[PDB]
Amino acid sequence: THWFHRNPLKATAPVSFNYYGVVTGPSASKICNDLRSSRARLLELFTDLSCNPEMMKNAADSYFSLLQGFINSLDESTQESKLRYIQNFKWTDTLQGQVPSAQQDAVFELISMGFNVALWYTKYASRLAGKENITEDEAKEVHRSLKIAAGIFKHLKESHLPKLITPAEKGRDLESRLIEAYVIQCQAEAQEVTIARAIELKHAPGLIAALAYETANFYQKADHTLSSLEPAYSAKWRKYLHLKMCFYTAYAYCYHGETLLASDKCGEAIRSLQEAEKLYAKAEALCKEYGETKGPGPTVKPSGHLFFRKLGNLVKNTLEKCQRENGFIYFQKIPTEAPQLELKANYGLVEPIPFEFPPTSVQWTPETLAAFDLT
């Protein structure tokens, strides 16, 4: 079973898009009704178990292509829409709890909403990957939901975040480091899915070890990116990433030891296994330290180990082979340092699905824009 720590969904205040005197004629005033309802619908799906990617993809697409007229220019003369600052939007943040923050910037809405959509795909993926029944086509669905979420986040960070006039506030969802932390985690989680698959399809030990090593690295690299944050809100989540890094370094040494045993290097296989078991114990302690850290989102539990399955057997095969010049119990002669892993994954590495917002709705014309008439 897969267990993915989840921070809560962002929440927002309703927006009616009612400008009264500003808006004129059916066209413009009809656009404001569509935004009203598209945003309303898109906000409902977030909490709806019924909702699938096909439904979400359609809701978001609709709303964003309409909201895109508050950001982009229609003509290529001007750089940007004249409506950008017309509306005050209000949003909470994954790590900040009940406390919201407002900006009257349409771009602030685009990124907060787009962020939530991304956040949705990962939550949809985790419910899914949590099932015991989980099938192949469903596993692939999780792998994919994660790569989409990742590509969305990445796109916010790269092409969008730079445009906000309000400077980035540490701890808020809308700052660079934190979005980067989400992008990494998503890739990290897609690779876990692959690792389970590779262990189940009985793929080569070297392949698994490498993909496990690369995965632990993404987790370490994520935790690092969050190290700039204050402990209050970031502590539990960081304890989780630390936990996931240990878990997968355990797997790395475990499957790597098998590699070593096959190469007839006994003191090293033994040493690789001891570090695997050692890191797993570390991971269990962290899992305890994690369960006891207060912060955003509920705690999750791993359970469901396949690990000592594999471990018990490698330990059995190593000793059966290595008593010889090494065992039986008090061990000689074993390297003091754990065998260093620079392992390179040729298979399983996940990259984000490149994402882009829809162009401006066809409902947007120089005329229907001019029907707004600020003044």
Partner: peptide
Amino acid sequence: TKNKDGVLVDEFGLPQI
């Protein structure tokens, strides 16, 4: 589907058995 090396790959990027 084949990676850069011409090896067949499944949807997950793993080789085909």
